[PDB]
Amino acid sequence: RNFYEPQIITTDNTFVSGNCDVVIGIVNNTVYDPLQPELDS
Amino acid sequence: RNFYEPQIITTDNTFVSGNCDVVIGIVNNTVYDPLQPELDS
Numbered sequence A, B: 001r002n003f004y005e006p007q008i009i010t011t012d013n014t015f016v017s018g019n020c021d022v023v024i025g026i027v028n029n030t031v032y033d034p035l036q037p038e039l040d041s
């Protein structure tokens, strides 16, 4: 909040609560998964 | 800070900010890599 330091959205620094219906003003964007699934081939 | 309880350095309990140049007094040590790369068949 108090300093400008942008970061890439990741599934680790954001938690998940419920489905997409109930909230108001929610926007549609993809969320990057952690490095380990990307490392897996 | 308030009690002595040493722990093994791990990539999960430490976050990463930038490269090695800008800080002062930084020392050279190896950080335990996560379990996913270690657990490879």
Ligand SMILES: *[C@@H]1O[C@H](CO)[C@@H](O)[C@H](O)[C@H]1NC(C)=O
Residues within 6 Å of the ligand: A024, A025
């Ligand atoms: C915010 O205000 C604008 C006013 O133009 C409105 O169109 C928009 O629906 C408002 N946002 C939400 C989430 O309702």
Ligand SMILES: *[C@@H]1O[C@H](CO)[C@@H](O)[C@H](O)[C@H]1NC(C)=O
Residues within 6 Å of the ligand: B024, B025
């Ligand atoms: C701490 O002080 C000592 C004094 O001997 C000095 O040599 C050292 O460079 C200082 N630490 C840093 C990070 O500058």
